[PDB]
């Protein structure tokens, strides 16, 4: 039988989990509210990996990239998951600039 949707989802999750774990402590740059930057990593989220992976799959293009075994846009994913979950991140970040950086990264990975 061809791969089922459930089987493909498991494959995608294991690929995303691998890429996120591999770079879990890597510090990425995010826009502050004063024309500066702050550093953040997946380790700051204090979320279980499953919850991180489930939210990452929502970033458009990430499921396709993971299905294909291609590199995912990790800074964009982190920004998104942190925006959805982390109060400290919310207070540090300038949302309008975050939108632009996430879009720039994501457009630049999905083509």
From Swiss-Prot:
GO terms for molecular function: molecular condensate scaffold activity; RNA-directed RNA polymerase activity. The keyword Phosphoprotein applies. A motif (Nuclear localization signal) lies at residues 26-29. GO terms for cellular component: host cell; host cell cytoplasm; host cell nucleus; virion component. The modification Phosphoserine is found at residues 25, 86. Phosphorylated by host PKC and by an unknown kinase. It comes from the Viruses. The keyword Chaperone applies. Keywords: Chaperone, Cytoplasmic inwards viral transport, Host cytoplasm, Host nucleus, Host-virus interaction, Inhibition of host innate immune response by virus, Inhibition of host interferon signaling pathway by virus, Inhibition of host STAT1 by virus, Inhibition of host STAT2 by virus, Inhibition of host TBK1 by virus, Inhibition of host TLR pathway by virus, Interferon antiviral system evasion, Microtubular inwards viral transport, Phosphoprotein, Viral immunoevasion, Viral RNA replication, Virion, Virus entry into host cell. Non catalytic polymerase cofactor and regulatory protein that plays a role in viral transcription and replication. Stabilizes the RNA polymerase L to the N-RNA template and binds the soluble protein N, preventing it from encapsidating non-genomic RNA. Also inhibits host IFN-alpha and IFN-beta signaling by binding and retaining phosphorylated STAT1 in the cytoplasm or by inhibiting the DNA binding of STAT1 in the nucleus. Might be involved, through interaction with host dynein, in intracellular microtubule-dependent virus transport of incoming virus from the synapse toward the cell body. Belongs to the lyssavirus protein P family. One of its GO terms (biological process) is symbiont-mediated suppression of host cytoplasmic pattern recognition receptor signaling pathway via inhibition of TBK1 activity. This is Phosphoprotein.
